[PDB]
Design a protein around this nucleic acid. Structure first.
Ligand SMILES: [Zn+2]
Ligand SMILES: [Zn+2]
Ligand SMILES: [Zn+2]
Lengths: 332, 70, 110, 66, 331, 814, 81
RNA sequence: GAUCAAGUGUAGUAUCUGUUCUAUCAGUUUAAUAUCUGAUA
């Protein structure tokens, strides 16, 4: 029974979205993952309607997307993490209406594997470095450089592997033009595996670890690591340098916490609940996703709860120190 | 062979029921995290957000089968 | 120390504790997990260990031309006109020493 | 029979090297195995014009031991 | 929690219509437990516009599938397959089969054959012996499949889909016998027996393909008036696709060569091997990816030339043969 | 004292012995580093680094020590920085790239270890030094300091240095550091660029010629590093540079022209126009300059300005080309290889913008020149231009001059020149159909040079035929190609293999052109002449001879006997395993032609008889040959013969057909699908058989069948073969068990990981350790191979009292 | 033994005698994937080493089709040591 | 089948000739044996 497969209706569900000047022009597009398909969208700022410019079956499981830009560049690259086990960088070519594969670097076997990288993708804001991280143990960092011709160049991967470590999320920290840093929410599971009582599992704490890439010495150092009060589900990169105070918001169960390395104290804000909520009181509340808006003189985050309620989040600063997190309810 | 030890979740002649099942459960949860459709299925079945399903799976990675045998 | 080699189920006890007493062999009792072993031996499409694993001798220390060949064009047609599939063993039918001695139209045919 | 006779010859040094291509040897030649005679009659005929007409370790040269 | 539904007539009541709804009571998903279940019966009335409640019948475990069978209803309660007559105050269990390996997800029927979807142990073929009042397992699959949905292609053939984004087609080999006994003393569960700890006869997997995404519907149908018949599937990411039979080698071997050349000349964007992707859980078998073949039209003319040359054709002929197979079944 | 001897022991175990000894000793030094102390440890390490005898790999391992002890010691190095640095600094100036990068690495590590203030306080007294060599190294040290640390960190020091009024030497060194930073960092400069330009900017204006020179070079280096971005940063320096261009002279002007040359490519099209025109008023004046350093610069600036987008092709055509050709395209410029390559490049870039014909028409008049080296220069330029742009732009009247000149140059060079061969081949291949009128002149010129008495000169004539016979096809081809071939047929007796290889390479080019009936040495005369040549020892001869016998077999099979072909196959047979890749590929291609020529039957019968009677070396060659006769011609013609050889009741012939099958399946790949069912019963017999080598190589057939047929169905036949492979899992002989692992790793792909798991389950927890060891070895291969696929295939395992083992999410219903 | 460090940007090389062989399986059939080696194995004297024997490399090393299918391109830097 | 001595050969794996095996218990060990180490005759 020989058979021919045809798609009639492409998948419509979205699992990742990134925004950027993928065309290399003033206007912004959105690249969306539909799991098996990569798609480019243009919202028309006049008509409001959203136009699908390009759809490509990638015959793989997309697991992470990041936009990134080399310092000085006009155009955003798409870096893709997938079940393939190869880190792929794409450039949208507006003239040919195609995604062009600028680099493909190989680091492991294929499938949605536990210890092979691809699930988590973090890029330095300046675009200097990209870190691809597996759920467990294996994390790899690729340095990014611009050649004379302005074509993209990918450095050989630098190993940053810590055994028995589960990673919940990784984000690039904005350090301005200092050495790139990545932040990971990680839990070490070695003690739970060796404790017959189960106390070790209960007393295992997630840590926030900052891995710094010393660009000069080509090595990745696990420079700071710190236990959190409660388990975070994801991280948000806070604007750094001139733009902001740097650091990373941890979204966690019932809370949002701001952390930075050095003299910066922890600031923690509870997630506001709905008045008269009919929900089961045993249920905690998490933020499910976030967007950042960075503007010429200010920034804010939008973060959405499990109920669909969006909070605008702002950070008050005195000198370069955050002093409070402010949450205004925005919309549902 | 020795080099198989580079790869977590392999076994050997003195691998126990608990060691083997803990690797099956950890590999399963990592697979669920990667396969967007398999994650869709669980979110719809539980009536729970994909972000909470992912979080609950990550929490289950620590001690997926309960404590070691003794 | 020999003590743990005494700290085992009897064959009787293992035979009664399990859903499938017909898969329980004398040796199974001596395993590090006889209850997991007997469970795996009972799984619905699982293949038994080659029976010679306990034999003192090494494995095998105890041709005819297929009909369509044996039967330019003739030699092509042996492969592309009259070639029959041989008798094929089913999944799990391991070789061993003594092995040898309503309408019904099919959907999606051509 | 593995014995072969040869005519239209030019040394023993030439002869053995020349005939070794048709298979292992233990004017006239003596091959290990009969099929060398088929090869000689096919190939060494006409190869001057050459002309042709009809223990353990020695056999162990034909073995496929790794 | 309603998990199953059927609309049917019963032999005893003739014309009268009934809706049977299978319900779990206090189901906990993880770790799994349940306070048994119910089947609710309603008499469909007012030309199928109103549900008149008739009775609520308790059952021991979730009635996860319901299927009308020979003027009676077949309900799968956990691992038990049971035939239920309508009754008056409650459904009556005419027959029961306890030999299903695990939880039953779905039930298809054709003639006296019943195809049961196990949650993990894939497809079991059962015959109802009408006079003898028995449900007999006569064949099973040789693989575990986490079946989500199933469709009958013919009397011998089942298309299935699973939780891991695969489709398969399983067929009973020729001269499979459905006229099988079960022993009244116990012999066929003691002496006489099945193969590999399953049934005595096995289904052949004649097709395997990783769709790349979980399928919860399969239906054999014609999508266009006077078009060819197709197997239509739908997915959790909202995709709709078809699997369509090639009518001859003049199609099949051509698209086989097209797929082979596109695998090398136009490899997947994010660095996967295509053959590996379509072979994710099982090796790909008897399916050609038209989602890859139709990328021919999106290649630069340099590659379109080179690929078409290795196919003995010009690019317009390749593009046309792609359009021809789509329009024959799909819109 | 004795612990310093332990440092010697540890150094010895790093410098000598096995890698784990090195690894252990390094771990020892590095963790002990705190105890040893920086002073003693560097008093001992630096003498090795100073030794002239130290190899690159010894130095590299000593660097791999130095990094780690520097990390461990940290602040402890501060008193010793001065001593450490002066030993290291010379590496930064070494001509060896690896010695150089290693010096940068250890200065980087030393700068991470020591505080910035200490690096500054160490190197500051050398900023002010009288020796330019000391300043030069110090500038390179500080550039590396800047690279390891943040560039902003060093900026406040540079701001003090570049305004150090009391010493021009200091201000100069500051700007050297700013230049060296740009050379080291590259495009990483860009976010710090305006900060660096604003440090240099006042230097261009200074009262000291040295400081103006180095500041212009700093701006050149920054512009080079920034390319194509960063123009907004340089807006400060644009005015100072023109005010300098209009005023300065000599190498002090060459510096400013260098800066400008790197700035113009950064500019927008409007500024590119304005500032290019500003250049030319002075750059055209410098075309007259006697200085070779200046001449190097002005060609660079021309290349950069004319390569920029803004500048009109018409502007170049009117204002650049006349003075450029006047001053540079003259005989004196051929004399120096530096100027030569620079002029050729600059000129090719002018062609890229202005067109082929505009440049070529100013050059071609000198193809007929006196001087060989100047004719070489123009020929290399025409070579490059027509390689880039082709003949399209060229007028008929310019073809005439090209070809006349090209012919004259070829007949003129006393010694075979590669450039003349390139130029002639390129121009003829570019012109193509247009060459038709000139073919008699070309042919006569070739034929003349092919009758020359010199070996090398005839090699060059044959090479030229080889590169151009495709054009010579055009007309009277039978007449001209044919006589060239008869001349080549005489040279088939060449004493020199370098030449003979080219004769063959020219004959090969003729038969790829001529219809074989019109051959002038008939094929009956050609092939016998080649048969002794196949045995020549020289690679070039063998390649071209085998490849030529290839084309005769391919294109003209009919002209020679079956037996003639048969003898050729039997001689070619060993070359299938020759050392050289080219010789093997030629043999494989051409055995494939000759197998078609003979027809498969008797060539195969001959190969199967050879397979019974030769040594292991030639027997493996027949397994390769039999597979070529299968992939070429028909596989279905090969397998029936192999099936019959397996019916012979002798272990050696039977073992032979298994090697033949194992390579046949590797080699034919995807074609194997048609043949699995036919070969299956042979593999049953072979894999049931008592012989260890039968079972080894039947397993190897199963590996190659499996990997060859992946995705084409056939899993029924592969499941069946797995029932005969699998019992061999307890074999103990190294060769059989590695072949069995190979087969299982093959079948994991073609049957899938589910099936392979179903064969493993009953053995993973079997009572016997010798079953478990074997089953876990197999499982681990399946697991590493297919980790994510196994998720679907793992059996249901029930919960225990203490432990949960069901996977509940997969039990869920929708 | 094989090196099995994570591979990088450096391409593996082969000497003339070993030209066209697959480093992993030593077959000469169907080279498919370019061999990539770790930076350490391609540094200084080590730069340009034949992957199989360490001789000067005249050509790029290529993993065979059979090895690429089995994902044996992915195990890490196949420099023999 | 295990085990001791001797010849021979190879990149590596080994082949090949001449011996031993006669009672129980305990320990070590093994899937179970066996070997090995003690004890009783
Ligand atoms: Zn290989
Ligand atoms: Zn390496
Ligand atoms: Zn080599």
């Amino acid at each position: 029974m020989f058979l021919y497969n045809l798609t009639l209706q492409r998948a419509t569900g979205i699992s990742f979205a990134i925004h950027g000047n993928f065309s290399g022009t003033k206007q912004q597009e959105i690249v969306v993952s539909r799991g098996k398909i990569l798609e480019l969208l243009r919202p028309d700022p006049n008509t409001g309607k959203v136009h699908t410019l390009l759809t490509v079956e990638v015959f793989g499981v997309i697991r992470s997307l990041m936009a990134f830009r080399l310092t000085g560049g006009t155009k955003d690259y798409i870096v893709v993490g997938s079940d393939s086990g190869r880190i792929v960088i794409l450039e949208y070519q507006p003239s040919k209406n195609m995604f062009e594969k600028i680099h493909q670097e190989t680091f492991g076997k294929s499938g949605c594997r536990r210890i092979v990288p691809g699930q988590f993708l973090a890029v330095d804001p300046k675009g200097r470095a990209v870190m691809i991280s597996a759920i467990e143990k294996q994390k790899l960092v690729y340095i990014l450089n611009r050649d004379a011709a302005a074509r993209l160049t990918i450095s050989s991967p630098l190993e940053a592997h810590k055994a028995n470590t589960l990673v919940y999320h990784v984000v690039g920290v904005d350090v301005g033009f200092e050495n790139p840093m990545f932040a990971c929410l990680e839990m070490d599971y070695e003690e739970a595996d060796n404790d017959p009582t189960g106390e070790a599992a209960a007393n295992t704490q997630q840590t926030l670890t900052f891995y710094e890439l010393d660009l000069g010495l080509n090595h990745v150092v696990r420079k700071y690591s710190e236990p959190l009060e409660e388990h975070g589900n994801f991280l948000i990169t806070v604007p750094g340098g001139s733009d902001g105070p740097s650091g990373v918001l941890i979204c966690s169960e019932n809370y949002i916490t701001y952390k930075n390395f050095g003299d910066q104290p922890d600031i923690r804000c509870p997630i506001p609940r709905r008045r008269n909520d009919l929900d089961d009181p045993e249920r905690g509340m998490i933020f499910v996703c976030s967007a950042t808006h960075k503007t010429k003189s200010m920034f804010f985050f939008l973060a959405q709860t499990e109920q669909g309620d969006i909070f605008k989040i702002t950070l008050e600063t005195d000198e370069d120190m955050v002093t409070e997190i402010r949450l205004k309810y925005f919309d549902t | 062979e020795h080099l198989q030890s580079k790869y977590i979740g392999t076994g050997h002649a003195d691998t126990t029921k608990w060691e083997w099942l803990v690797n099956q459960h950890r590999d399963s949860y990592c697979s669920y995290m990667g396969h967007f459709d398999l994650l869709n299925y669980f979110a719809i079945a539980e009536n729970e957000s994909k972000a909470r399903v992912r979080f609950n799976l990550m929490e289950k990675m620590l001690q997926p089968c309960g404590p070691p045998a003794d | 120390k020999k003590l743990r080699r005494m700290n085992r189920f009897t064959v009787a006890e293992l035979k009664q504790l399990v859903a499938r007493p017909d898969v329980v062999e004398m040796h199974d009792v001596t395993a590090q997990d006889p209850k997991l072993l007997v469970h795996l031996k009972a799984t619905r499409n699982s293949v038994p260990v080659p029976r010679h694993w306990c034999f003192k001798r090494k494995y095998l220390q105890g041709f005819e031309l297929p009909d369509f060949i044996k039967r330019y064009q003739k030699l092509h047609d042996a492969f592309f006109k009259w070639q029959t599939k041989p008798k094929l063993t089913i999944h799990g039918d391991l070789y061993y020493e003594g092995k040898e001695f309503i309408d019904r139209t099919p959907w999606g045919e051509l | 029979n593995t014995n072969v006779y040869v005519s239209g010859l030019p040394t023993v040094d030439e002869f053995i090297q020349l005939m070794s291509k048709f298979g292992i040897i233990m004017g006239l030649c003596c091959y290990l195995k009969r099929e060398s005679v088929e090869l000689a009659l096919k190939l060494l005929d006409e190869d001057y014009k050459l002309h042709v007409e009809v223990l353990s370790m020695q056999q162990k040269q034909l073995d496929w031991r790794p | 929690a309603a998990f199953s539904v059927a609309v049917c007539r019963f032999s005893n009541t003739g014309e009268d219509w009934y809706v049977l709804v299978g319900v779990a009571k206090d189901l906990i998903l993880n770790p799994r437990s349940v306070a048994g279940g119910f089947v609710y019966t309603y008499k469909l009335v007012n030309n199928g516009e109103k549900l008149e409640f008739l009775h609520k019948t308790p059952v021991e475990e979730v009635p996860a599938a319901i299927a009308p069978f020979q003027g009676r209803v077949l309900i799968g309660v956990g691992k038990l397959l049971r035939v239920y007559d309508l009754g008056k105050k409650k459904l009556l269990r005419k027959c029961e089969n306890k030999h299903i390996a695990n939880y039953i997800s779905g039930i298809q029927t054709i003639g006296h054959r019943v195809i049961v979807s196990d949650v993990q142990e894939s497809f079991i073929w059962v015959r109802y012996k009408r006079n003898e009042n028995q449900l007999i397992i006569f064949a099973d699959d040789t693989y575990p499949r986490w079946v989500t949905t199933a469709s009958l292609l013919d009397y011998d053939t089942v298309a299935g889909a699973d939780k891991f984004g695969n489709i398969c087609v399983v067929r009973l080999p020729p001269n499979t016998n459905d006229e099988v006994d079960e022993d009244p003393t116990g012999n066929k569960a003691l002496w006489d027996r099945g193969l590999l700890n399953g049934a005595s006869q096995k289904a052949e997997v004649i097709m395997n393909y990783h769709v790349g995404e979980t399928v919860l519907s399969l239906q054999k149908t014609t999508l266009i008036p006077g078009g060819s018949e197709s197997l239509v599937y739908t997915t959790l990411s909202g995709g709709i696709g078809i699997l369509v039979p090639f009518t001859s080698h003049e199609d099949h071997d051509f698209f086989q060569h097209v797929e082979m050349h596109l695998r090398s000349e136009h490899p997947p964007l994010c660095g996967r091997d295509h053959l590996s992707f379509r072979s994710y859980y099982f090796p790909v078998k008897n399916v050609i990816d038209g989602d890859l073949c139709e990328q021919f039209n999106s290649m630069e003319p340099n590659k379109q030339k080179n690929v078409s040359e290795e196919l003995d054709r010009t690019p317009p002929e390749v593009s046309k043969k792609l359009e021809d197979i789509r329009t024959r079944y799909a819109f | 004292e004795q612990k310093e001897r332990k440092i010697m022991k540890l150094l010895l175990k790093i410098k000598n012995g096995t890698p784990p000894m090195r690894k252990a000793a390094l771990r020892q030094i590095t963790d002990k580093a705190r105890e040893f102390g920086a002073g003693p440890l560097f008093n001992q390490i630096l003498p090795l680094l100073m030794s002239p005898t130290l190899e690159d790999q010894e130095r590299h391992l000593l660097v791999k020590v130095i990094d780690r002890i520097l990390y461990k010691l940290d602040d402890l190095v501060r008193p010793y920085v001065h001593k450490i640095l002066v030993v290291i600094e010379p590496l930064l100036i070494d001509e060896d790239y690896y010695a150089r990068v290693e010096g940068r690495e250890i200065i980087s590590n030393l700068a991470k270890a020591a505080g910035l203030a200490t690096m500054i306080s160490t190197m500051r007294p050398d900023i002010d030094n009288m020796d330019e060599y000391v300043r030069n190294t110090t500038a390179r040290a500080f550039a590396v300091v800047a690279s390891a640390l943040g560039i902003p960190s060093l900026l406040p020091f540079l701001k003090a240095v570049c305004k150090s009024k009391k010493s021009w030497q200091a201000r100069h060194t500051g700007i050297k550091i700013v230049q060296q930073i740009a050379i080291l960092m590259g495009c990483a400069i860009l976010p710090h660029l305006r900060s660096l330009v604003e440090i240099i900017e006042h230097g261009l204006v200074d009262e000291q010629q040295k400081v103006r020179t180095i500041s212009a070079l700093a701006i050149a280096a920054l512009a080079e590093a920034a390319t194509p971005y960063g123009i907004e940063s340089f807006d400060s320096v644009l005015k100072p540079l023109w005010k300098g261009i209009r005023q300065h002279r000599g190498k002090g002007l060459a510096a400013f022209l260098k800066a400008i040359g790197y700035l113009i490519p950064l500019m927008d099209a409007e500024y590119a126009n304005y500032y290019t025109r500003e250049v030319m008023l002075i750059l055209i004046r410098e075309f007259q300059s006697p200085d070779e350093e200046m001449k190097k610069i002005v060609l660079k600036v021309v290349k950069q300005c004319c390569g920029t987008d803004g500048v009109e092709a018409n502007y170049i055509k009117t204002e650049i080309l006349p003075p450029f050709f006047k001053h540079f395209w003259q005989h004196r410029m051929a004399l120096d290889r530096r100027n030569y390559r620079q002029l050729v490049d600059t000129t090719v870039e002018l062609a890229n913008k202005v067109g082929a014909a505009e440049i070529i028409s100013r050059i071609v008049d000198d193809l007929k020149d006196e001087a060989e080296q100047y004719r070489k220069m123009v020929m290399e330029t025409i070579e490059k231009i027509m390689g880039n742009l082709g003949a399209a732009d060229i007028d008929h009247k310019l073809e005439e001059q090209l070809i006349d000149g090209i012919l004259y140059a070829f007949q003129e060079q006393t010694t075979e020149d590669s450039v003349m061969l390139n130029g002639f081949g390129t121009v003829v291949n570019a012109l193509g159909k247009r060459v038709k009128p000139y073919l008699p002149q070309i042919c006569g010129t070739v034929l003349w040079r092919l009758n020359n008495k010199s070996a090398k000169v005839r090699q060059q004539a044959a090479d030229l035929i080889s590169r151009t016979a495709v054009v010579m096809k055009t007309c009277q081809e039978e007449k001209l190609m044919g006589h060239l071939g008869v001349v080549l047929y005489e040279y088939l007796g060449e004493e020199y293999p370098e030449v003979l290889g080219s004769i063959l390479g020219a004959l090969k080019a003729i038969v790829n052109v001529i219809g074989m009936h019109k051959m002038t040495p008939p094929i009956k005369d050609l092939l016998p002449r080649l048969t002794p040549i196949l045995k020549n020892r020289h690679e070039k001869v063998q390649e071209n001879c085998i490849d030529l016998v290839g084309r005769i077999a391919d294109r003209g099979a009919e002209y020679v006997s079956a037996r003639e072909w048969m003898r050729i196959c039997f001689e070619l047979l060993e070359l299938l395993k020759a050392h050289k890749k080219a010789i093997r590929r030629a043999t494989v291609n051409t055995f494939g032609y000759i197998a078609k020529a003979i027809g498969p039957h008797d060539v195969l019968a001959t190969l199967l008889n050879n397979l019974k009677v030769q040594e292991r070396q030639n027997r493996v060659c027949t397994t390769v040959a039999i597979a070529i006769v299968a992939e070429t011609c028909s596989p279905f013609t090969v397998l029936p013969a192999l099936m019959n050889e397996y019916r012979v009741p002798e272990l050696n012939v039977q073992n032979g057909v298994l090697k033949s099958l194992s390579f046949l399946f590797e080699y034919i790949g995807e074609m194997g699908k048609d043949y699995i069912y036919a070969v299956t019963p042979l593999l049953e017999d072979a894999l049931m058989d008592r012989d260890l080598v039968h079972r080894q190589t039947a397993s190897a057939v199963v590996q190659h069948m499996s990997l060859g047929v992946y995705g084409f169905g056939c899993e029924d036949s592969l499941n069946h073969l797995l029932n005969y492979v699998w019992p061999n899992v307890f074999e103990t002989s190294p060769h059989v068990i590695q072949a069995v692992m190979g087969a299982l790793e093959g079948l994991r792909v073609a049957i899938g990981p589910c099936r392979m798991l179903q064969y493993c389950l009953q053995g993973l927890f079997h009572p016997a350790r010798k079953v478990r060891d074997v089953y876990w070895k197999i499982y681990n291969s399946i697991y590493i191979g297919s980790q994510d696929a196994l998720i679907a295939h793992y059996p249901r395992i029930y919960n225990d009292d203490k432990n949960t083992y069901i996977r509940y999410e997969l039990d869920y219903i929708l | 033994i094989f090196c099995r460090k994570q591979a990088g940007v450096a391409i593996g090389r082969l000497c003339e005698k070993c030209d066209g062989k697959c480093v992993i399986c030593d077959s000469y059939v169907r080279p498919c994937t370019l061999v990539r080696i770790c930076d350490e194995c391609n540094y200084g004297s080590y730069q340009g080493r034949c992957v199989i024997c360490g001789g000067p490399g005249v050509s790029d090393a290529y993993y065979c089709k059979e090895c690429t299918i089995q994902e044996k391109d992915r195990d890490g830097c196949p420099k023999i040591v």
